[PDB]
Design goal:
The structure is cut from a larger assembly and holds chains A (about 50 residues), B (about 50 residues), C (about 55 residues), D (about 110 residues) and E (about 50 residues).
Chain B (H helix, E strand, L loop, with lengths): L7 H7 L18 H5 L11
Chain C lengths: L1 H18 L10 H15 L9
Chain E lengths: L6 H13 L3 H14 L4 H8 L1
The chains are: A mainly alpha (about 50), B mainly alpha (about 50), C mainly alpha (about 55), D mainly alpha (about 110), E mainly alpha (about 50).
Chain D binds 2 RNA strands through loops.
Protein name (chain A): Putative pre-mRNA splicing protein
Function (chain A): Involved in pre-mRNA splicing and cell cycle control.
Organism (chain A): Chaetomium thermophilum (strain DSM 1495 / CBS 144.50 / IMI 039719)
Chain lengths: ~50, ~50, ~55, ~110, ~50
Amino acid sequence: LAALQKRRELKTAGINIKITTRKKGQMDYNADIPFEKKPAPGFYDTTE
Amino acid sequence: SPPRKLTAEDQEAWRIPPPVSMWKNPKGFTIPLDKRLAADGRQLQEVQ
Amino acid sequence: ESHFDLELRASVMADLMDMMPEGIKQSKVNTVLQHLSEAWRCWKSNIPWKVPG
Amino acid sequence: TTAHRPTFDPARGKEALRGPAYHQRLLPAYTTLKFRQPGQGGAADKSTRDLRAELEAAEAAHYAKLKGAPRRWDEDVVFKNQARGTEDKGKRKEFVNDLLRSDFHKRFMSKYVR
Amino acid sequence: DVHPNNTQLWIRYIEAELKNRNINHARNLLDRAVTRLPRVSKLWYKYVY
RNA sequence: GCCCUUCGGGGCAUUUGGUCAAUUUGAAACGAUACAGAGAAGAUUAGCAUGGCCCCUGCACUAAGGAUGACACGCUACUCAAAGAGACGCUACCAAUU
RNA sequence: GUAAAAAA
């Protein structure tokens, strides 16, 4: 909560920076759908 | 093969009693003393 | 001893899954492994183990 | 405290990693198979009925061999003959499928707990 | 993939698609589910309903 | 260059290779400092395991150790009712002290 | 205090 407050104050007063808590040995679940398993196609079209 | 047709008496006959240990209490529960002494057969034990 | 316990628990569980009739609700089976532990402690203390019901 | 827990989902065996050979794991040993020699059997089938026949022949031979088919100092005292019927133990050895009531365990506890 | 034959899981997935109006996704799931579990009458009843 | 020649000619030998030698911007890691701070339902703690998108030391990828090496301790509707008993429910709202 | 930016 404190870090969020400080980042919001910086973004309000101009400077925007990427506080990145990404450690050593951790995936980026935001970056990509992890271990993505798409639904199997069936007889019905699902493009729409 | 088609599922076995069970009765409510079959369900009751395979329900399992909640185990109260006389030694272990991992969650630190407070168990009522009748429930603590239920599974003891030393109340059953008869001496002639 | 840790390995014997792992093997024993797997054997008792496989027997119980194969003993249970199809269609009984089967979440609480680890409950039976707790009964197995308590029965073993009862044997070590020479206390008769008799769960009502 | 669920740090110390049972195993509900035991580890599944995996295909081996595939790569270049550098690490040395398993030193060669017993690199020749022995095969059954003349006189060592194994690769000698007769027949089902033949094997049956030698089975009852051997078993009947064993059964037939078992059956045999080709004032006084000791009158002062107060208790008398108290060891009759004791030495007559020893007719047949009974295996008992309860370890704590076996004669082996009874012997063990008599020897070691005093 | 972890629970291939779980009726409750199949129903959750089918109902998530139906609740969010993905009717074609849901009917593909219903065909897949009654292919996977053809003696589970719950999935057949859900599909006819 | 050499050799052969019948003086026209012919022969011998035949395609390397490692992104430069250049340190900011194609990826080294401690320590110091700051801070906090060690499992088992009261206190103190011998450990042995379990699972892998956590590894370290080790020849050990068939020891052992690393705090029992750590992690574990959040979260919590969803295969889902039925019976019988009520309901100014579904409309209106109403004329004497002496 | 040795092993993770009038409630030692």
